[PDB]
């Protein structure tokens, strides 16, 4: 299981941070993919980050709205936004990618819970 | 050209000739 | 309160000397008879500064001793501290720390140079902050303003605020052509605004003040386009994609079907919008230009493979399955789409009809359990390949409006004008319509088959009918070639609209030729 | 007869004579 | 176009040309070259 | 993970405004759902992305809310809108 945070109890106007923590394996040694989904239709895929080589495959539909940052001090992947607006209603998937020893990509595990609100 | 295997048809050749048309009021060529 | 600045704001555009010349300069000025807002300081809110302001005042005590320009006034935007202590016009362009209300009773630049009118025209051109003035003890007169001082500050200012320790005006200068009148000594004795009244631009064209009785082509009349009309044929010729994705049976992995798509229109916008399709990866094309551009030789490859093989079919991928099943080109252009089909293409007992090749010489069953991974579930894959004609997206489709100058665009051709219902008939293959001059004269819209002409916008000349300035000041305005419903007493004639004058059923030997029959007089 | 025997808008403006044909 | 004498210059069969008649009643494969279009 | 909807019950005339709310727990980003579901059928989901607007969606349907609560307002009840609106939990 991958551990994230649950819903809201808080007033608007506050800044906040999320996390996507894995257990039983090295988080920085596994590919992490961020997939965006929110109420009404299917998914959107923006890209993935590999902290080992900083290789980013940006989806063409992405227009540089959500900055991508990494924290090597704590070896944890965090997502931040440069400029927040009221029209930022999106949810982000976090899942384990293909293994380092495996040259074939697959999506075997999906998130456990983040029901999202600001 | 191929026909139906078990009639005075022509064959011409085209070449870049200047050519003056004559349209009528319906947009077809009458001369 | 508002008042009328009759002929105020006429300074010297240059230090160039001129004698007895009617010189026309297109210099920014306060327009004649403009709207000047009289203020009373009994407060002093911030005031606008567009292209300078024609200031003015009438004080017998010199109560105004402060200017504050700029935007922020917090020592960030360059403000000014012009002050007049009745002995010298000292000009401080430095920065002072202003509080909420600047005190009455680090600097960058410092500089020193009832029965009175104190006009203080400003300007800002080429970073040359001019400060004019004229003290002639608002009447029906005329007084030119000499360039008292000039300041090469070279900064941008767009707001100011007169400050004192009770009648401070403001103005609005706009880039108005303006015809001057110098006397022998080289000062300005009279002036003429240009876009004030038809006689004003008459004076502009003649470059004189004493216009004679006549008609002058001061400018030309033009009807600008109103909106845009872009039309494309019906989307009723949709591509038969409904029966392709909804087919009961699909081909095998080794027998992937390839189909040609042509002579139809497909809305790919919804296709890439909704994502019931699990994977949507595009290479070599921009989704931004998908709705704006279309491709040639579009091919669709549809097949069903397991989940974990989706990423193996990609450039720069090495493996047994990828090399021995299907090789993608290095310059692959298109999109790869794969989606789950376990709800409709899976059975509990298992399907043995799927077979695979074990050995191959040279390059060009399944266990169904509830706990099995997604990669083992069957996935439908459709790949669209594009090459950089007859198949294109709907792009833009706007409705049709007639009897108004618009920007019509039929099937991809430009042109602006007014569309008229017609009667002449075409041939079914014919679309355009032209006269002897080889210019479009009719058209059939791409949606329906009704024939509508194209006639140019109602343009023409616009002439001013005047008596002499020594005789009258109100004038008529001719409009050439245009009827008088596009543009005082309107009057229509073959010449066109003649706003300004009055029809007379009588007739005299005329003096001012109008055109196409009419003459004007006074 | 003379009128019959004697036989578009692209910036050029054929402005009418004041003295119309009539 | 309507009631205009338009002059275009492209590929045509010239007037009164020596058009090569053929018989449809050598004839197993009556192939002839396509040079610049055929009427 | 607990879900609650408010108000539990309401009484109003035909065409009256209807407002419902859905509540939450913890710390999170910004995105949450609403579904139109019958008594025992599959849910339905009209508008998407909450920051993009779908073509063909009637403008009479809208969503709002910030911080904790979500406000869905029914300006006029319709014969085709007779169902219970569910904010649904998934990841
Ligand atoms: C043009 O076509 C119409 C078809 O209704 C025909 O009646 C007419 O004689 C044709 N020729 C003309 C109008 O000169
Ligand atoms: C005189 O000039 C100084 C210097 O700018 C200014 O501070 C002051 O307000 C002016 N007037 C008087 C009465 O001192
Ligand atoms: C185009 O479609 C409209 C309705 O969508 C129809 O009324 C019209 O006749 C069509 N145009 C044709 C068939 O030329
Ligand atoms: C001006 O427009 C009206 C309405 O379209 C038209 O009836 C009139 O004939 C036009 N003017 C002239 C001189 O034709
Ligand atoms: C056409 O060509 C043939 C030979 O190819 C020639 O005998 C004949 O006279 C030509 N036709 C005319 C009208 O000259």
Residue numbers in the entry:
A (entry chain H): 3 to 120
B (entry chain B): 240 to 245, 263 to 287
C (entry chain A): 27 to 68, 80 to 142, 165 to 172, 186 to 209, 216 to 243, 263 to 461, 494 to 517, 522 to 620, ...
D (entry chain B): 821 to 827, 854 to 868
E (entry chain B): 44 to 68, 78 to 91
F (entry chain L): 2 to 92
Question: Which lines from the publication concern this structure?
Answer:
Our cryo-EM structures of the spike-Fab complexes revealed a three-RBD-up conformation for the complex with all these class 4 antibodies, because only in the open state could their epitopes be accessed. All bound RBDs are in the “up” conformation. The other two subunits are from IS-9A-bound Spike shown in transparent surface. IS-9A and similar antibodies such as C11817, H01429, S2X3526, S2X25916, DH1047, and BD55-123931 exhibited more diversified binding modes, and their footprints cover the lower part (residues 373-378), the middle part (residue 408), and the upper part (residues 502–504) of the internal RBD surface. From surface accessibility and antigenic variation analyses, it can be deduced that IS-9A and similar antibodies exhibit increased neutralization potencies because these additional recognition sites (R408 and residues 502–504) are more exposed, but their neutralization breath can be compromised by emerging variants with mutations at or around these sites. For example, IS-9A, IS-11B, and IY-2A efficiently prevented both the attachment of biotinylated RBD to ACE2-expressing MDCK cells and the binding of biotinylated ACE2 to recombinant RBD, which could be attributed to steric clashes with ACE2, as observed in superimposed structures. IV-6D, IV-4B, IV-10C, IS-9A, and IS-11B were isolated from an adult at day 8 after the second dose of mRNA-1273 COVID-19 vaccine.
